[PDB]
């Protein structure tokens, strides 16, 4: 399961699909709702 | 004294390990290859000729054609054009008014031959 609404600010989760951390766009790994969920 | 075409107090940088490609080191509300872009701004000062910053859409909501695209490359105003930096015309589709229309505008694909269109932007009045 993906989705960044889940907490949205834990950090990098090495066993997890999309990421919700501050560098996800760098690593090109965000959830498509990152921007929305925690960055409105 | 200065170097590279960095604008807005950009600081130039290069790297010996990479064919000395050079590029700007920009402060704060400026980005773009040359700190050319006032990523802060949301309206234009009278006329718009000196408006930089983003905004990519005309009145109808239609998105601007990029100043470096092949179609735009056929018009009078495009990014491959010497004065291009001084006119705010680059590798982006941000609104500009390099030819002193009443306001900021851009090329927009309506029909074949694309049309110049007054652009989605507010006057700071």
């Amino acid at each position: 399961q993906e989705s960044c609404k889940g907490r949205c600010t834990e950090g990098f989760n090495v066993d997890k699909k999309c990421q919700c951390d501050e560098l996800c766009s760098y690593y090109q790994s965000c959830c498509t709702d990152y921007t929305a969920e925690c960055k409105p | 004294p200065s170097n590279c075409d960095c604008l807005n107090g950009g600081t130039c940088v290069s790297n010996k390990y990479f064919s000395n490609i050079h590029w700007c080191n920009c402060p704060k509300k400026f980005g773009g290859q040359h700190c050319e872009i006032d990523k802060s701004k949301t309206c234009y000062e009278g006329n718009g000729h000196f408006y930089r910053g983003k905004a990519s859409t005309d009145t109808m909501g239609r998105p601007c054609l990029p100043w470096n695209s092949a179609t735009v490359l056929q018009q009078t105003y495009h990014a491959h054009r010497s004065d291009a930096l001084q006119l705010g015309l680059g590798k982006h589709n941000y609104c500009r008014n390099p030819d002193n229309r009443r306001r900021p505008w851009c090329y927009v694909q309506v029909g074949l031959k694309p049309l110049v269109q007054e652009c989605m932007v507010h006057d700071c009045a």
Binding site: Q28 | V13, K16, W23, G31, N68, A79, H80, K91
Partner: protein, 273 residues
């Protein structure tokens, strides 16, 4: 050999890929800053002893990512970079750089690499002062993720007015610690001669004098090669690592091509004779 010639402003054309020289290359710089980002791409001819390489580092809120790829076919820089290529994050290193002094003021940061081949790097690039009218605009300290030419382990050269150094290591955070300053590493015992410039005025007997090598740079070295805006003949003498006396690692340092590097052990063995 023909290549794609492309300025960052994106204007392109085809060049009959220069004379003697024969690789085309693409170089990409990705400037990344919280959400937003920007990509500069350059393409052109280049000389043969260039290769595939990365370097990536954090300055404050931002990361920069250099990368340059190399092929050798009448048009092959042609086409786009290279879903998901970052399916993961790999080695963790310290990173900072001189452009915001993050390096100099110990504001170092964790940075994870984007590929399984990248190692942690500390590069030093120091210049006394002028040559053209200001000289290269390399950050003086840069550290981060990368794979640079002739890497595993280390290399360095210094002389009267320059100092360059690459640490490059495959272990976790093996690039951390205080930033080297040369005037700061031990004298190793060797003395070597030092100059830049031409064999006559630049590197003449009267202009070449000894210096005390430091750190692991404990071979005396002589390099001759051909400089950019294609002014031939450039010579350089100094203290180096054996690593430097192997391969054209001095090439990229001194913006030089087609280069011979003699080297030796006994102090002073370095003179134009």
């Amino acid at each position: 050999l023909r290549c794609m010639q492309c300025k960052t402003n994106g204007d392109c054309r085809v060049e009959e890929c220069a004379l003697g020289q024969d690789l085309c290359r693409t170089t990409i710089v990705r400037l990344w800053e919280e959400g937003e980002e920007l990509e500069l791409v350059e393409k052109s001819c280049t000389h043969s002893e260039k290769t595939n390489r990365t370097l990536s580092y954090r300055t404050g809120l931002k990361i920069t990512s250099l990368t340059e790829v190399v092929c050798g076919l009448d048009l092959c820089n042609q086409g786009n970079s290279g879903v998901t290529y970052s399916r993961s994050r790999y080695l963790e290193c310290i990173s900072c750089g001189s452009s915001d002094m993050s390096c100099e003021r110990g504001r170092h940061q964790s940075l994870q690499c984007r590929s399984p081949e990248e190692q942690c790097l500390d590069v030093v690039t120091h210049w006394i002062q002028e040559g053209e009218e200001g000289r290269p605009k390399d950050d003086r300290h840069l550290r981060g993720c990368g794979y640079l030419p002739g890497c595993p382990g280390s290399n360095g050269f210094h002389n009267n007015d320059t100092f360059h150094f690459l640490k490059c290591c495959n272990t976790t955070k093996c690039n951390e610690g205080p930033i080297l300053e040369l005037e700061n590493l031990p004298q190793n015992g060797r003395q070597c001669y030092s100059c830049k410039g031409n064999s006559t005025h630049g590197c003449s007997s009267e202009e070449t004098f000894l210096i005390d090598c430091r750190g692991p740079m404990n071979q005396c070295l002589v390099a001759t090669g051909t400089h950019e805006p294609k002014n031939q003949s450039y010579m350089v003498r100094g203290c180096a690592t054996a690593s430097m006396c192997q391969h054209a690692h001095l090439g990229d340092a001194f913006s030089m091509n087609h280069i011979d590097v003699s080297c030796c052990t006994k102090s002073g063995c370095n003179h134009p004779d």
